From a paper:
Can f 6, a recently identified lipocalin allergen produced from the submaxillary gland and detected in dander, shows a high amino acid sequence identity with Fel d 4 (67%) and Equ c 1 (55%), major cat and horse lipocalin allergens, respectively. Lipocalins are characterised by a common tertiary structure exhibiting an eight-stranded, antiparallel β-sheet closed back on itself forming a continuous hydrogen-bonded β-barrel.
In this study, we produced a recombinant protein of the dog lipocalin allergen Can f 6 (rCan f 6) and determined its three-dimensional structure at 2.35 Å resolution. rCan f 6 crystals diffracted to 2.35 Å resolution and the structure was refined to an R-factor of 20.3% and an Rfree of 26.9%. For the final model, four rCan f 6 molecules consisting of chains A to D were contained in an asymmetric unit and had nearly identical structures with an average root mean square deviation (RMSD) of 0.63 Å for main-chain atoms. The high RMSD at Val111–Gln115 reflects differences in packing environments among the four molecules. The estimated molecular mass was 19.9 kDa, indicating that rCan f 6 is present as a monomer in solution. Hilger et al. modelled the tertiary structure of Can f 6 and Fel d 4 in silico based on the crystal structure of Equ c 1 and showed that these allergens share highly conserved structural characteristics as well as amino acid sequence identity. Consistent with these findings, the X-ray crystal structure characteristics of Can f 6 remarkably resembled those of Equ c 1.
Residue numbers in the entry: 6 to 164
Amino acid sequence: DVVKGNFDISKISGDWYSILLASDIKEKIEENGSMRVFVKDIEVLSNSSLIFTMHTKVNGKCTKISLICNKTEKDGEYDVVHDGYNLFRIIETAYEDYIIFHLNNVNQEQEFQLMELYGRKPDVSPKVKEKFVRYCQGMEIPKENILDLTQVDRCLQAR
């Protein structure tokens, strides 16, 4: 059951897996890029803040990190500081299957977007993935800038 607004944030908590990653600047999400991090779980706090626990590669090793995201004034939007100021929202979710987040990173040099699909399981339906691709094309992210992480190291081994 697919939700596209009025998200019930309580239902996005718990464990997720990073499945697709996309950006309008490809380097951001390729190996070594600052945005190539692999979600573990999302914790929702009493003040509506969210804590993303994730893994990133540090000298070849999966290292746990924690991202604090705060609700902005604007509805559905969150901000988080990581390699700049990021504003993000939920595009779509089936709470027990997948979720798609859109993010704008603002920085002195060049704004970029990210799009990410997480699954409750390590993989999701190829239909869902195609739907993520079309959302990306609508946002001027070309399909060549869309990485599927199911057959690469995404720190599953460190979870």
